[PDB]
């Protein structure tokens, strides 16, 4: 079609399937296996990318060009890698992926949205869509084209360290919140076939429905463990949102570390090929989790040859290696060379990978747009996060007796007020895991507004605001305070580090609440990724708010505390009386909740 050196796969006017087939037909085995390989930026160099025909890069949690890097530093990094991949014989661009799971959260100055559990409290799928949209822009600001989100796990036991990454214990809520997908990717056409991948263009990103399947059903909430449930329960609780994702054109699906009735998901051909590909008709690419194939065996890594065979025969298309690429490539090449893995399986994985890259426009815009850099941390996005944070708050108590004047909303004018607690002025704690570092961190880790900062920005100029992190009872009684706001809760955690069998917040937390509330009427703001033992905090407090992990915009908290808006959030999870009850979900025999799923008190705006 019209020049003498014309190559159909390079012609942007041709249909994606024709471009895929035309490119696939020219590729060597090495070129094919290279597409199937995703590596960490930490092991990538121009020569490694070129010589191994690498298909994809990622940043794992905390893998950044440097601390504090600007949006343009990210763009330059990603373009440097792309430049190498475009210099190969076939010039196939790489796709760069990152965990942008509550904003573009690895990046300094990125807007940090509430974590998923809080978003489930909003019951507002359109808000989540808009959060998708903002997140796509902030990811493209850094030159990155692919976000490992949404997590559509249905957490069935809050002892799990990733329970905050699940919108709800109720699959219906999780289903509703798959609107993140068309936020990230754009809306699919009227005509769209369910299971086809979609991304609108250069201002959107490929999404990833993760982690397939039953990641939130593991025994005792143990991370990466076994999920014991008949096919009917799997299909009724853990699967449904995957079908909503297919309907909205999710481009990729990541496989779970977890097992189903003892079968490693990363080795499960019946579910990956038989169900996801052959029954749901998924036509995007299937990606492993980080060393997910390694973890097929025990010990992990003990038979990498079998890891590669089992995973690729099960139907995985791209492997998140992410470090030992030479070994992965060498072993997979051996398997194809000895007939253990047929060419048809390679060609299917590469078809899927190229389908997503061509569909999303990556061959037409392989490089970053520097005009997008300024999207990072844009005030419109912070305003959105602030709206989400406010809508996520669940008011659990507002008055010790039914006859008390309701404490909330608090007045903005008062002579003197106290702000206290370990979580009142700690941005890191209010963001939780997957913020700047993998495990999150403490203190002023990025740009945002702590609860203390938000109180000071909200109150009348005549209101004196005193901060004390852990005041004693006498300090409070002697202080002349009108009221206190006290914020406490969980420390940041991610993944197995957050698996917790007792779910009691660290001290001092409760002790500070008791000392503050003992002296002056108090509003307790509980920061957590999940329900935690709360009766003692409730007993001390006039009012108590479950604020979850609200992110960078602390003003979302004060917007509701001071009555600019009313509380509307409703628990997206059951709140247990005791961890001995667990697991306990809306539906079981012994359903005896402290607060039932859907509970939440309200207030009216002042
Ligand atoms: C970088 O993510 C985590 O890093 C630690 C330490 O290097 C690993 O040992 C963990 O098992 C992974 S977990 C895995 O990471 C994916 C990529 O960051 C992520 O998308 C997925 O949701 C996680 O399960
Ligand atoms: C399928 C699976 O992951 N099972 C693990 C098992 O290997 C381990 O003995 C245990 C440790 O707590 O957790 C569970
Ligand atoms: C009261 C109690 O036992 N608290 C513990 C804490 O010390 C520990 O770090 C965590 C580990 O999951 O579990 C919780
Ligand atoms: C300040 C306040 O409590 N206002 C009201 C309450 O009396 C009522 O339950 C409802 C009626 O609109 O709205 C709220």
Numbering used by the authors: -3 to 602
Sentences from the paper on this structure:
In the barley β-d-glucan glucohydrolase, a glycoside hydrolase family 3 (GH3) enzyme, the Trp286/Trp434 clamp ensures β-d-glucosides binding, which is fundamental for substrate hydrolysis during plant growth and development. HvExoI folds into a two-domain structure consisting of an (α/β)8 barrel (domain 1) and an (α/β)6 sandwich (domain 2) with a 13 Å-deep active site pocket embracing the subsites −1 and +1, positioned at the interface between the two domains. HvExoI catalyses the hydrolytic removal of nonreducing glucose (Glc) moiety from a broad spectrum of poly- and oligomeric β-d-glucosides. The crucial role of substrate binding in HvExoI implies a pair of the aromatic Trp286 and Trp434 residues that form a clamp at the +1 subsite, which is positioned next to a pocket-shaped site at the −1 subsite, housing the Asp285 and Glu491 catalysts.
On the other hand, in W286F the electron density map of G2SG-OMe was defined at the −1 and +1 subsites, where this thio-ligand formed H-bonds with Asp95, Lys206, His207, Arg158, Tyr253, Asp285, Arg291, and Glu491, and stacking interactions with W286F and Trp434, whereas G2SG-OMe did not bind to W286A and W286Y. The dispositions of G2SG-OMe at the −1 and +1 subsites in the W434A, W434F, W434H, and W434Y mutants revealed similar structural features of the ligand binding to those seen in W286F. Notable was the behaviour of W286Y that showed increased catalytic efficiency values with (1,3;1,6)-β-d-glucan (laminarin), laminaribiose (G3OG), and 4NP-Glc, while these values in W434Y were considerably lower.
